[PDB]
Amino acid sequence: SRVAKAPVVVPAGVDVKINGQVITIKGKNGELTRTLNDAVEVKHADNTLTFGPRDGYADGWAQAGTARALLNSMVIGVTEGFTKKLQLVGVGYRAAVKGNVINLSLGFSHPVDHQLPAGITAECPTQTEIVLKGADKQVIGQVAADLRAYRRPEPYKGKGVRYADEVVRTKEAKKK
Amino acid sequence: MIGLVGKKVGMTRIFTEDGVSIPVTVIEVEANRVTQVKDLANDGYRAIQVTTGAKKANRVTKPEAGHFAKAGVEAGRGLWEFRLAEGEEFTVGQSISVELFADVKKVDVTGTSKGKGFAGTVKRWNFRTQDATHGNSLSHRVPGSIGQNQTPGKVFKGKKMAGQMGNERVTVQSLDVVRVDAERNLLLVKGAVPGATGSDLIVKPAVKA
Amino acid sequence: MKVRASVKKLCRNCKIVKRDGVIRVICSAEPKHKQRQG
Amino acid sequence: PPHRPRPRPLPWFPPR
Amino acid sequence: MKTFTAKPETVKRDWYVVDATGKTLGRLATELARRLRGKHKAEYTPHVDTGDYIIVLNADKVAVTGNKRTDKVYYHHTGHIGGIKQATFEEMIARRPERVIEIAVKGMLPKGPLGRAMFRKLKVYAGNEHNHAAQQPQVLDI
RNA sequence: GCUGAAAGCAUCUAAGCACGAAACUUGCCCCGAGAUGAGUUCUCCCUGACUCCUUGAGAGUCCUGAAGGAACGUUGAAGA
RNA sequence: AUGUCGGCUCAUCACAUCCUGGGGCUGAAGUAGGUCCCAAGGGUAUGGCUGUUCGCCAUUUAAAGUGGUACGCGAGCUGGG
RNA sequence: AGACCGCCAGCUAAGGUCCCAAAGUCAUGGUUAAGUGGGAAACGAUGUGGGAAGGCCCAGACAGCGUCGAGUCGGCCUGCG
Numbered sequence: 098s099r100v101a102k103a104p105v106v107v108p109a110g111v112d113v114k115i116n117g118q119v120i121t122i123k124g125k126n127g128e129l130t131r132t133l134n135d136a137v138e139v140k141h142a143d144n145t146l147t148f149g150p151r152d153g154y155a156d157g158w159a160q161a162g163t164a165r166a167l168l169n170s171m172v173i174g175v176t177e178g179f180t181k182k183l184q185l186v187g188v189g190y191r192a193a194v195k196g197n198v199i200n201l202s203l204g205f206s207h208p209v210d211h212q213l214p215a216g217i218t219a220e221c222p223t224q225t226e227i228v229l230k231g232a233d234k235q236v237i238g239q240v241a242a243d244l245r246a247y248r249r250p251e252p253y254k255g256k257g258v259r260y261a262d263e264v265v266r267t268k269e270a271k272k273k
Numbered sequence: 274m275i276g277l278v279g280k281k282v283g284m285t286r287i288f289t290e291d292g293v294s295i296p297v298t299v300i301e302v303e304a305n306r307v308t309q310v311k312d313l314a315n316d317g318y319r320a321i322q323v324t325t326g327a328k329k330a331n332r333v334t335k336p337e338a339g340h341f342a343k344a345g346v347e348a349g350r351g352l353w354e355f356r357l358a359e360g361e362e363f364t365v366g367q368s369i370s371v372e373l374f375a376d377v378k379k380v381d382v383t384g385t386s387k388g389k390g391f392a393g394t395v396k397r398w399n400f401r402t403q404d405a406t407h408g409n410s411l412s413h414r415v416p417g418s419i420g421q422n423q424t425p426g427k428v429f430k431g432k433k434m435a436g437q438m439g440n441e442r443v444t445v446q447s448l449d450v451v452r453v454d455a456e457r458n459l460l461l462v463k464g465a466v467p468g469a470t471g472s473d474l475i476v477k478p479a480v481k482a
Numbered sequence: 483m484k485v486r487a488s489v490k491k492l493c494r495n496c497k498i499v500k501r502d503g504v505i506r507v508i509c510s511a512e513p514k515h516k517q518r519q520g
Numbered sequence: 521p522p523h524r525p526r527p528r529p530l531p532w533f534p535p536r
Numbered sequence: 537m538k539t540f541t542a543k544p545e546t547v548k549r550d551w552y553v554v555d556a557t558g559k560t561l562g563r564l565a566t567e568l569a570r571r572l573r574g575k576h577k578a579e580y581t582p583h584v585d586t587g588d589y590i591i592v593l594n595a596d597k598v599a600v601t602g603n604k605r606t607d608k609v610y611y612h613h614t615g616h617i618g619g620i621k622q623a624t625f626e627e628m629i630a631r632r633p634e635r636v637i638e639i640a641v642k643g644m645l646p647k648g649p650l651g652r653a654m655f656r657k658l659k660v661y662a663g664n665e666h667n668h669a670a671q672q673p674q675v676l677d678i
Numbered sequence: 679g680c681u682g683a684a685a686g687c688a689u690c691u692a693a694g695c696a697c698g699a700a701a702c703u704u705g706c707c708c709c710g711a712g713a714u715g716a717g718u719u720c721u722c723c724c725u726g727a728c729u730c731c732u733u734g735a736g737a738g739u740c741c742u743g744a745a746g747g748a749a750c751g752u753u754g755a756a757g758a
Numbered sequence: 759a760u761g762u763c764g765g766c767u768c769a770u771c772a773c774a775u776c777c778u779g780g781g782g783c784u785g786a787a788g789u790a791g792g793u794c795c796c797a798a799g800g801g802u803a804u805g806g807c808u809g810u811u812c813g814c815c816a817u818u819u820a821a822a823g824u825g826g827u828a829c830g831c832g833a834g835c836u837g838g839g
Numbered sequence: 840a841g842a843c844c845g846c847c848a849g850c851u852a853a854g855g856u857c858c859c860a861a862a863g864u865c866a867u868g869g870u871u872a873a874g875u876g877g878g879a880a881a882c883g884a885u886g887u888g889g890g891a892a893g894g895c896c897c898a899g900a901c902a903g904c905g906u907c908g909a910g911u912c913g914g915c916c917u918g919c920g
């Protein structure tokens with residue numbers, strides 16, 4: 098509702114394309130496309146998208162609020178793009194990007210090689226840092242979580258793949 | 274990948290220089306001749322039909338003779354089909370030799386097991402015998418109880434009982450290919466395979482591998 | 483995870499949430515507080 | 521406890 | 537003067553074709569069962585099959601309400617001890633979509649020889665094509 | 679878990695998306711078209727005359743007897 | 759007249775899981791545990807004593823699960839009680 | 840609801856009217872999303888409908904960070920889950 102009320106601006110160099118329910122947002126960074134819920138009415142109007150409930154649906158407002166938030170992020174995706182940073186804490190823990198493959202070394206007896214999806218690119222500022230870049234906010238989120246899964250931060254020394262801005266609550270081993 | 278049809282010649286051993294005796298079944302694999310090719314358009318699946326061996330012309334009925342004639346191959350002792358993988362291709366009339374197995378490390382071998390006739394539960398299902406003595410009355414090798422009581426008041430399907438044993442299709446999987454002698458039409462496989470000496474064997478590259 | 487008939491907020495940070503027809507308590511700070519009704 | 525005696529035989533009678 | 541009775545040798549049976557696409561399974565099935573039995577004809581006779589032949593196309597696109605698509609379970613027993621098997625509506629549609637309509641209709645037809653005969657007049661196809669042009673089926677909207 | 683509103687936040691869930699076990703469906707082995715919903719493919723065989731009747735998927739006579747099958751015999755690591 | 763304990767033979771189901779599989783929390787450093795959730799595919803001792811079931815004991819095992827089936831099973835055996 | 844017998848007539852009772860299986864896929868207005876309906880308790884819970892008050896509120900509240908701009912907060916009774 099309150100999210101759905103606020104219309105999202107369409108900056109210059111951003112081309113919308115409403116095709117019933119299917120939307121397509123094009124820009125400099127990349128191309129994104131989605132299919133909205135059938136209870137969402139979307140209008141281009143004056144170079145600013147606005148959302149509201151189609152009638153005959155009880156969940157119209159809720160569905161509009163999410164549709165708004167998604168399109169808002171599709172806009173920022175094709176312009177600025179999204180960025181996630183992952184630290185590797187732990188002795189001997191290293192990463193290495195090789196095209197669209199991240200070769201991890203996470204204290205296993207075998208090499209971890211995560212194949213990246215379509216519109217994601219990774220970097221290695223240092224050995225113990227990965228920087229993901231992409232248009233889709235959901236996909237970059239997934240990939241980051243996938244990498245974190247390999248070796249989640251443990252609560253005694255905080256060893257493992259963590260997000261840059263993640264508070265890892267540690268605790269002491271029981272006395273005696 | 275396709276297989277070949279062969280004949281169980283018998284068992285022997287190969288001595289290795291490093292002083293190991295390998296027990297081998299000797300499988301004679303004559304040329305398998307393609308009699309028919311099945312395709313999706315006509316048959317709905319891809320396969321070859323092959324024949325092997327020979328047959329006296331007077332034992333070949335007219336329906337069978339016509340089938341061999343269309344292919345332009347000599348009558349063999351039977352027909353067997355092999356499903357084709359997507360890459361494979363064959364033509365009617367083509368011979369396939371045991372050279373097929375030149376690079377194959379392990380095979381599955383299918384045959385008809387020896388026939389034991391009507392077998393008891395001790396032999397057929399490894400049931401335990403009851404006491405030989407200590408008062409047992411006429412119930413030394415009999416199967417014991419075959420069910421519960423009023424619930425369920427029946428015997429369940431698949432209950433293990435006396436019956437025909439052997440004389441059925443059996444596959445032994447993942448046998449080592451010890452030797453492939455194209456010139457003698459021989460395949461040596463390590464270990465025993467189903468059937469009596471002289472029986473037909475189907476040999477295929479191992480599915481598990 | 484504590485599985486109980488009676489699930490409750492134990493602290494202020496505890497949040498009740500229904501997921502897939504099941505009441506849960508989630509607590510960022512204290513994993514001990516994690517509960518599922520069952 | 522047992523609710524029946526162990527089976528026993530009957531005396532012979534002229535059968536027909 | 538006795539009440540009329542249809543005669544198997546003189547009864548006229550027509551061919552119809554129905555599109556299952558987006559139809560609610562149970563509400564389609566009742567209409568099929570009605571027509572297979574011949575309850576829509578004035579010559580309806582309970583011991584005679586007076587019904588019509590019906591082709592059902594696009595069985596794979598039949599609809600169900602609620603969470604039935606994932607939660608409706610089909611059970612069968614193989615007859616071997618422990619041999620209770622099950623499949624969700626979703627699994628059935630993937631493996632054998634025609635069975636879903638056939639099962640729904642069979643359960644709504646009389647049990648016995650006549651009901652089995654009636655069911656033989658239903659021809660269910662997963663897709664949009666059939667091979668009964670020779671029977672010249674008329675389109676039937678259900 | 680990701681994205682994400684309802685609820686300006688938060689939230690794995692409502693829309694959407696991703697992982698996830700010897701369980702489930704397959705994959706392996708065997709049976710299997712009486713699967714009466716009785717399926718498919720290949721090959722082989724038969725190309726006479728006449729009469730009658732309540733006229734039809736009718737009956738009868740003569741000629742013809744195929745492909746193949748069965749019987750019989752010698753038998754089998756097949757078998758009561 | 760619906761033969762009764764235990765043994766033997768042959769089982770079959772439940773899951774409130776003994777092992778193996780997956781997971782959350784831990785007063786979880788590791789190893790090893792505790793506890794709860796999911797899971798029924800398969801597996802799940804041999805002996806001494808006693809009519810025993812059980813139990814105790816010896817020695818194993820990944821484990822020696824708990825129950826239902828006329829306290830499963832004598833027109834299948836035994837007949838110690 | 841009390842069968843004296845016959846009828847290939849008609850009207851009703853309880854109970855019913857999508858198909859099995861006779862009769863509404865009847866009408867109008869609500870509720871439920873649980874296949875609840877079609878098995879059960881203490882107790883638990885921002886499920887959702889209705890009703891009556893109250894506190895705060897363009898002298899700028901509640902949420903997020905002095906800033907931003909309209910309804911919101913937490914109990915009561917009650918329907919269905």
Ligand SMILES: [K+]
Pocket residue numbers: 711716
């Ligand atoms: K057939």
Ligand SMILES: [K+]
Pocket residue numbers: none
């Ligand atoms: K048992």
Ligand SMILES: [K+]
Pocket residue numbers: 798799
């Ligand atoms: K199990």
Ligand SMILES: [K+]
Pocket residue numbers: 828
């Ligand atoms: K009893």
Ligand SMILES: [K+]
Pocket residue numbers: 833
């Ligand atoms: K008995």
Ligand SMILES: [K+]
Pocket residue numbers: none
């Ligand atoms: K006996």
Ligand SMILES: [K+]
Pocket residue numbers: 874877
């Ligand atoms: K129900």
Ligand SMILES: [Mg+2]
Pocket residue numbers: 387388389390756
């Ligand atoms: Mg034999």
Ligand SMILES: [Mg+2]
Pocket residue numbers: 401402
């Ligand atoms: Mg023994």
Ligand SMILES: [Mg+2]
Pocket residue numbers: 410
């Ligand atoms: Mg005696």
Ligand SMILES: [Mg+2]
Pocket residue numbers: 409410411412413
């Ligand atoms: Mg004896």
Ligand SMILES: [Mg+2]
Pocket residue numbers: none
């Ligand atoms: Mg019964």
Ligand SMILES: [Mg+2]
Pocket residue numbers: none
């Ligand atoms: Mg009936």
Ligand SMILES: [Mg+2]
Pocket residue numbers: 700
């Ligand atoms: Mg295993």
Ligand SMILES: [Mg+2]
Pocket residue numbers: none
């Ligand atoms: Mg359980």
Ligand SMILES: [Mg+2]
Pocket residue numbers: none
């Ligand atoms: Mg399995």
